[PDB]
Amino acid sequence: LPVEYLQVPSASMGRDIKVQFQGGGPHAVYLLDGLRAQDDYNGWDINTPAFEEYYQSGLSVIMPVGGQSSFYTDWYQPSQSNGQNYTYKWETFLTREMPAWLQANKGVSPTGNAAVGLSMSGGSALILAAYYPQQFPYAASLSGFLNPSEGWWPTLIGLAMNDSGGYNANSMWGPSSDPAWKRNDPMVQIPRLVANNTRIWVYCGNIPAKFLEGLTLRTNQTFRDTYAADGGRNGVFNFPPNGTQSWPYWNEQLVAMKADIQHVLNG
């Protein structure tokens, strides 16, 4: 497999970002990592046969490396906690710096791509499509936080970020009253997804665990209902009863959506 590891400078973060890359077409699937993203390899490559599965698909595969608890967003400030000495600017990196580099050096198109995220980055993928539709006509959220600004979620997200490397949600989007929470909330941005005619693929499977499961189920159902209510007509919603929040099932969804991505991005 022709897999490469690239060092892509980020001016906005003042450091080089490692990117795992497999070519195979001008359009690409951006495979975003989960909450506990490591600095050596992307979780998709650690845990799944994603590169092999998309080999000769007619699509390039891009796996950025790093950004633990970042939500692939532009933060307000360095993390209030764990000694981070720069500000995460992952939205700038994914929408400007990285595609600029891949276009200039390899001819990867900056437009007409897919964003696929899981856990932490499921919502990120939808937000990228909401605000950058020419770049991401396709977005998939696998077990993402679909309503991060609502109810229990700002607290639960803050707790998860702190548990995953000691990152501080206040440094990211401010207190939960800050406009950044709603800005980055896929539920709140459903009208953009509808206006953009984004092709969305939304998966989810199924404090005490049962309480968390109830919150998750209700939020996911609300997202689906709201998408339809708001005139959404370009979505796939996969809620299989046996679905889990795990790399094996996230891989199953990545494989299942391959034909979908091929038809949307490559006709």
Sorted by where each begins, the domain ranges of the chain are 1-267
Q: What proportions of the chain, in percent to the nearest 5, are helix, strand and coil? A: 40, 15, 45
139: nearest Cα among 149, 150, 126, 148: 126
Contacts 24+ apart (CB under 8 A), 157-161: 160/35, 160/69, 160/120, 161/35, 161/69
**Count of H helices and E strands in the chain?**
12, 8
Whether the Cβ atoms of residue 128 and residue 139 lie closer than 8 Å to each other: yes
Cα torsion angle, 184, 185, 186, 191, sign: negative
Resolution number, Å: 1.4
Strand, coil or helix: what is 138?
strand
Under 8 Å between Cβ of 198 and 136: yes
Which residues are paired to 116 by β-bridges?
31, 140
Which residue carries 């709201």 as its tokens? 226
Cβ–Cβ contacts within 10 Å for residue 127, how many? 30
CATH H-level, domain 1-267: superfamily: Alpha/Beta hydrolase fold, catalytic domain (3.40.50.1820)
Q: What CA–CA distances, in Å, run from 183 to 22, 130, 262?
A: 32, 10, 30
**Comparing C-alpha atoms, which of 164, 212, 126 is closest to residue 34?**
164
Rounded to whole angstroms, how far apart are CA atoms 228 and 222?
A: 10
| Alpha-carbon distances of 253 from 125, 242, 244, rounded to whole Å | 15, 13, 11
Q: Which amino acid is at 156?
A: L
Solving technique = X-ray
